[PDB]
PDB file of C-alpha atoms and ligand atoms in Angstrom:
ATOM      1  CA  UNK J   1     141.015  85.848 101.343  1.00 34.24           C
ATOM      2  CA  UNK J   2     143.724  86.782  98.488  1.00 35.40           C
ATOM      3  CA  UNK J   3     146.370  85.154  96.369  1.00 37.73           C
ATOM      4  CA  UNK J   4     149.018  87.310  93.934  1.00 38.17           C
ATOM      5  CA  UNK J   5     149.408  85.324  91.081  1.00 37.39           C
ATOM      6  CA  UNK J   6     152.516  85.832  88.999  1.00 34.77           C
ATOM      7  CA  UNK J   7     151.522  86.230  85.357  1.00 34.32           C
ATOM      8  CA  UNK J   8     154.386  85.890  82.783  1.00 33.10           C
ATOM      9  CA  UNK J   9     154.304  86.082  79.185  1.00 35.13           C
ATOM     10  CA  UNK J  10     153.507  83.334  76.979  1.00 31.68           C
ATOM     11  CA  UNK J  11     154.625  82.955  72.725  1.00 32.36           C
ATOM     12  CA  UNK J  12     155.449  79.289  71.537  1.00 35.16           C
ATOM     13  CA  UNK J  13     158.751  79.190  73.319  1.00 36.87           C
ATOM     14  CA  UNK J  14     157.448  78.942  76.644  1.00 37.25           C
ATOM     15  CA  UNK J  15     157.974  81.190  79.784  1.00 36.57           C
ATOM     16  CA  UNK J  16     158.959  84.523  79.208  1.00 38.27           C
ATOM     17  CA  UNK J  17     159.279  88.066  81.209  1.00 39.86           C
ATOM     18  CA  UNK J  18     156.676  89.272  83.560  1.00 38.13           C
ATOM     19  CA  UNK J  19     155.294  93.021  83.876  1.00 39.44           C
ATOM     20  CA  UNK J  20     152.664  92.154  85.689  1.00 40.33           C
ATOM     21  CA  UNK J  21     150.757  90.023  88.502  1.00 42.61           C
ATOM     22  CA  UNK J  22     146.857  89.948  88.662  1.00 41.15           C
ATOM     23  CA  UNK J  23     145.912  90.110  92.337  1.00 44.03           C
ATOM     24  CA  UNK J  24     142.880  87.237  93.271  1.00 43.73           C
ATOM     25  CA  UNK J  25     140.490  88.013  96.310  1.00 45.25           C
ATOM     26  CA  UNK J  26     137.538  86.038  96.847  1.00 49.00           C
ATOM     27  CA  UNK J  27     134.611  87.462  98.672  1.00 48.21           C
ATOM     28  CA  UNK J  28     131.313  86.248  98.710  1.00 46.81           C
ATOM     29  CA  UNK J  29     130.585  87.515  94.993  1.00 48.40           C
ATOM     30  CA  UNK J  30     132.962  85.696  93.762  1.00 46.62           C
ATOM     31  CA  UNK J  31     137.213  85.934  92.891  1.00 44.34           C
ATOM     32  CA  UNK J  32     137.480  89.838  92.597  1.00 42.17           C
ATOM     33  CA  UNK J  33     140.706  90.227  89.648  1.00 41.69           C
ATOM     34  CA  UNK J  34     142.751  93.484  90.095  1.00 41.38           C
ATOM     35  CA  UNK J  35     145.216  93.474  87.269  1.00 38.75           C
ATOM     36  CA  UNK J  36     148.409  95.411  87.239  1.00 38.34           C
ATOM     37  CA  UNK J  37     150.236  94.614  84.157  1.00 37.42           C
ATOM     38  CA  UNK J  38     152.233  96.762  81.689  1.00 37.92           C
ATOM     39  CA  UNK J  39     153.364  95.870  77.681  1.00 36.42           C
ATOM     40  CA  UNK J  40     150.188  94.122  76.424  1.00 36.04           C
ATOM     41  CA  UNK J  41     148.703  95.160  73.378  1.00 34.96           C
ATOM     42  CA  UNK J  42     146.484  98.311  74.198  1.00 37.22           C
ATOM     43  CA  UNK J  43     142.314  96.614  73.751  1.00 35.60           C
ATOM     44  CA  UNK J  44     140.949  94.269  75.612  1.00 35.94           C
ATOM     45  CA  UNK J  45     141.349  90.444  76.354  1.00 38.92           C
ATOM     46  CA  UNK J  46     139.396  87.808  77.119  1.00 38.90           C
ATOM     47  CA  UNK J  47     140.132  85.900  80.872  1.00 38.97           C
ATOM     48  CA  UNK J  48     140.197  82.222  81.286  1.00 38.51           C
ATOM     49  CA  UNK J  49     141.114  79.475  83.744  1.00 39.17           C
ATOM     50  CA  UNK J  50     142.667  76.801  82.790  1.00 40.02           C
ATOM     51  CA  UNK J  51     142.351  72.644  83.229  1.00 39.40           C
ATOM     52  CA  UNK J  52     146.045  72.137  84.645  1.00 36.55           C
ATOM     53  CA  UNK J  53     148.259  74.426  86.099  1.00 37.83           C
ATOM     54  CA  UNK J  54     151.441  74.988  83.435  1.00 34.34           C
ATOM     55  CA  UNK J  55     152.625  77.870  81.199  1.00 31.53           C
ATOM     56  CA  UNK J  56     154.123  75.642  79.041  1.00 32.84           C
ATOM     57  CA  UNK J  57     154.324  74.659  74.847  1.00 37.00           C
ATOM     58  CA  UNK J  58     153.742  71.758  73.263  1.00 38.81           C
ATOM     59  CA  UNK J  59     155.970  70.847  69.507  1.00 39.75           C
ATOM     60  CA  UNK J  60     154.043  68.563  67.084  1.00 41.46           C
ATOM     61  CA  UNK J  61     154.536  68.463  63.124  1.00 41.12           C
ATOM     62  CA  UNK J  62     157.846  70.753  63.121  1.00 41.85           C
ATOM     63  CA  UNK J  63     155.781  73.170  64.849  1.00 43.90           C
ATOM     64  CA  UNK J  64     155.000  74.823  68.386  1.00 47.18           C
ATOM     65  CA  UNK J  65     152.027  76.015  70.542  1.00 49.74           C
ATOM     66  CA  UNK J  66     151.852  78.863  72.112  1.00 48.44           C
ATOM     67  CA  UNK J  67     151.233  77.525  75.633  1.00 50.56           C
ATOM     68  CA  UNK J  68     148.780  74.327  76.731  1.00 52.77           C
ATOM     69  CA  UNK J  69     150.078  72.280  79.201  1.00 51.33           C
ATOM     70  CA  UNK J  70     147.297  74.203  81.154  1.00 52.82           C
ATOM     71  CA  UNK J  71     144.826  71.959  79.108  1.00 52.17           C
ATOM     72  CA  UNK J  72     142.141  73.739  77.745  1.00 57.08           C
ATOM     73  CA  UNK J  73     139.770  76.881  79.769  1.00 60.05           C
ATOM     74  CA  UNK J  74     138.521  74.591  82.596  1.00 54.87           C
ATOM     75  CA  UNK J  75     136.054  71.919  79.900  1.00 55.29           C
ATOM     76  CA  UNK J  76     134.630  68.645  81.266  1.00 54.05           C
ATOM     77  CA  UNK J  77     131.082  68.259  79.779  1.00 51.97           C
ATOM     78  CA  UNK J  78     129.623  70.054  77.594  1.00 50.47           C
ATOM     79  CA  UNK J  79     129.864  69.924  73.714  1.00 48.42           C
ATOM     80  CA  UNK J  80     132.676  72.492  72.478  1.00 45.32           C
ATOM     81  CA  UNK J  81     130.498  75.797  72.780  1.00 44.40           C
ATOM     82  CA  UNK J  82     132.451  78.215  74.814  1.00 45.87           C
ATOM     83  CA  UNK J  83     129.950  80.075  78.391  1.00 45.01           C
ATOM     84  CA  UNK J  84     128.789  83.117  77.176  1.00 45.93           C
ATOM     85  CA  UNK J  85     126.130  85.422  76.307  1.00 47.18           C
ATOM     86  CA  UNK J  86     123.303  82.214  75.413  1.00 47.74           C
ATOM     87  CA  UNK J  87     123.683  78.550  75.695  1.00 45.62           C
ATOM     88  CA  UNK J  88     126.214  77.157  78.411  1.00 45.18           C
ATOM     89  CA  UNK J  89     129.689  75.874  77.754  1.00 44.10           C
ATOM     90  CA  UNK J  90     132.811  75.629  80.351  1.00 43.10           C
ATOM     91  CA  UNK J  91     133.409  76.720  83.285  1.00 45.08           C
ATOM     92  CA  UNK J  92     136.463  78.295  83.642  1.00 41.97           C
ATOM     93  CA  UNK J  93     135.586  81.610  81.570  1.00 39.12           C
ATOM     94  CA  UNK J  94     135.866  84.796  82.915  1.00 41.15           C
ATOM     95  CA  UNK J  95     134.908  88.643  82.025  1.00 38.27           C
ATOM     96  CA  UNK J  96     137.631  90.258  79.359  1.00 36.39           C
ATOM     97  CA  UNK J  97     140.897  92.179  80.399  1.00 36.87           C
ATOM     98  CA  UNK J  98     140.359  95.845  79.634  1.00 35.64           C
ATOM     99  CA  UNK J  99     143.371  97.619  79.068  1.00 37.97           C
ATOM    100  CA  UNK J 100     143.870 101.570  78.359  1.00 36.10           C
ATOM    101  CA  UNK J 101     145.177 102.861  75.044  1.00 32.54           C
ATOM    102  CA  UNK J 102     149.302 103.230  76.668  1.00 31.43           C
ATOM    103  CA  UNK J 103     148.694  98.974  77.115  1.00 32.43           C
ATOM    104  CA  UNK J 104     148.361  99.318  81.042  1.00 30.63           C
ATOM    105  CA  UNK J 105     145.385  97.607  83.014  1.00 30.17           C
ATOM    106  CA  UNK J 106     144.521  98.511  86.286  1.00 32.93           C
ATOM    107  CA  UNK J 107     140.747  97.305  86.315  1.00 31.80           C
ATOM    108  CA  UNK J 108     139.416  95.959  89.920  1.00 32.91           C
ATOM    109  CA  UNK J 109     136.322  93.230  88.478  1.00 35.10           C
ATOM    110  CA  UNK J 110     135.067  90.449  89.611  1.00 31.09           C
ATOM    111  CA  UNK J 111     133.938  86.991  88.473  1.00 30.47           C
ATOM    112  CA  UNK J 112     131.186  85.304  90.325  1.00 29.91           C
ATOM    113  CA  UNK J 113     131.694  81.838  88.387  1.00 27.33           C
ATOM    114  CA  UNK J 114     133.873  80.770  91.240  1.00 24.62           C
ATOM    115  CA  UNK J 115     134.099  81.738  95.158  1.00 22.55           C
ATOM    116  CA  UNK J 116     137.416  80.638  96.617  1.00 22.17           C
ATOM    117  CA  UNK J 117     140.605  80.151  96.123  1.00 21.63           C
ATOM    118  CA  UNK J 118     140.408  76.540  96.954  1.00 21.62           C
ATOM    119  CA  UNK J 119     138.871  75.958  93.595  1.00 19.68           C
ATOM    120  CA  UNK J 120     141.880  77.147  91.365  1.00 21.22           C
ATOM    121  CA  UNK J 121     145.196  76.230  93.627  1.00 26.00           C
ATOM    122  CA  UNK J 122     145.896  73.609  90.912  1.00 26.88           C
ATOM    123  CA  UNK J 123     145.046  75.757  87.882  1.00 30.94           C
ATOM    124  CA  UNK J 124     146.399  78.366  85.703  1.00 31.32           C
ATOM    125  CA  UNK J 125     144.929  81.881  84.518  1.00 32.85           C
ATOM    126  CA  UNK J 126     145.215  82.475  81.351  1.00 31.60           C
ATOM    127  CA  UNK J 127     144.875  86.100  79.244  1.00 33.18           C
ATOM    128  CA  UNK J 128     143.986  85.718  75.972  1.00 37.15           C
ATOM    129  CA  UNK J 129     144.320  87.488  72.753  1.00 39.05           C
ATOM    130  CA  UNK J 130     140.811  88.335  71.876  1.00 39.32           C
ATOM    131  CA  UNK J 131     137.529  88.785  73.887  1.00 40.17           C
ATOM    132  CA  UNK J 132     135.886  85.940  75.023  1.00 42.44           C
ATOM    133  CA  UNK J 133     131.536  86.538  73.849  1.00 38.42           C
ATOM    134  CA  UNK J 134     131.597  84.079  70.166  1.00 42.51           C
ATOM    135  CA  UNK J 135     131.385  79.918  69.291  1.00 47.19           C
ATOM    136  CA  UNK J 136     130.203  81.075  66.437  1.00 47.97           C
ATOM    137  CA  UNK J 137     132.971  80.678  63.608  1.00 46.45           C
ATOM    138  CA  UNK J 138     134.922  77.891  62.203  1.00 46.17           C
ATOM    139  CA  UNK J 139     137.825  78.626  65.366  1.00 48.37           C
ATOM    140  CA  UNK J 140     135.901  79.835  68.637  1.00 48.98           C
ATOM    141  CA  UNK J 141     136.166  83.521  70.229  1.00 53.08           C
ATOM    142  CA  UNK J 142     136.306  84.965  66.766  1.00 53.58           C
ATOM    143  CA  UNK J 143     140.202  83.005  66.285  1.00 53.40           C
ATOM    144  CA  UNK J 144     141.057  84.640  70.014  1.00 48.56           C
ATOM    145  CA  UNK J 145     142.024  81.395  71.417  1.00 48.87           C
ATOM    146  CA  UNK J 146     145.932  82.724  71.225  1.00 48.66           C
ATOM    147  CA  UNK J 147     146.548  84.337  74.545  1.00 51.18           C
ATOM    148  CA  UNK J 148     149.596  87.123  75.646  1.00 50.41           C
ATOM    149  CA  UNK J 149     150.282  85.763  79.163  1.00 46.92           C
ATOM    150  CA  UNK J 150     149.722  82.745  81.874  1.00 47.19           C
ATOM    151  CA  UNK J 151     150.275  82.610  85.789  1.00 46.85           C
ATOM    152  CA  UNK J 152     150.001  79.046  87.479  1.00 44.14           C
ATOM    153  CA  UNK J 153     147.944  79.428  90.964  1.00 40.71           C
ATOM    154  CA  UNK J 154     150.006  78.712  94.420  1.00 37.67           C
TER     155      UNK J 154
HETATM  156 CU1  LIG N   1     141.847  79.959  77.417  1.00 38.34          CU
HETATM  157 ZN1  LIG N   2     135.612  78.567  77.583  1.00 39.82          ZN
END
């Protein structure tokens, strides 16, 4: 079963342009991504879901956020540490966004920490600036908790 979601770009106004969807299809390893997008920055980028379902900022101090509405990447109990490569954190991280050197990404992955649709039709994904493997500095994933783009599941 399969769900397009609509990705737009995300940068402390709000709701952008798109370039891209990422095509969800859950099978019975998990929600297989298939990214198509265009215009990102050429690397790789780290792949969360998010607590609520909204591509929106927040203004606080004279000053914006990028986009949280979404909450934070999917975080109920735990202690802070992000899931990765020892320990345990939250559960709505996912394996990084790679993206060729002309900033297209075509990649068909999958991520096995979830196996349905049913549990993210109230969510948000989320692609974020850095990749996602570190807890391990004073601001987690290395400072890559700034993301390019968001797409509300529906
Ligand atoms: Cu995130
Ligand atoms: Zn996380």
């Amino acid at each position: 079963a399969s769900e397009k979601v609509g990705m737009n770009l995300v940068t402390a106004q709000g709701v952008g342009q798109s370039i891209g969807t990422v095509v969800i299809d859950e099978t019975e390893g998990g929600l297989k991504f298939t990214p198509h997008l265009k215009a990102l920055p050429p690397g790789e980028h780290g792949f969360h879901i998010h607590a609520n379902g909204s591509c929106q900022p927040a203004i606080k101090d004279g000053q914006a956020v990028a986009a949280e509405a979404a909450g934070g990447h999917l975080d109920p109990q735990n202690t802070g540490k992000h899931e990765g490569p020892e320990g345990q954190g939250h559960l709505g991280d996912l394996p990084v966004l790679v993206v060729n050197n002309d900033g297209i990404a075509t990649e068909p992955v999958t991520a096995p920490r979830l196996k349905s649709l049913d549990e993210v039709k109230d969510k948000a994904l989320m692609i974020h600036v850095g990749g996602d493997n570190m807890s391990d500095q004073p601001k987690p994933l290395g400072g890559g908790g700034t993301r390019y783009a968001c797409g509300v599941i529906k």
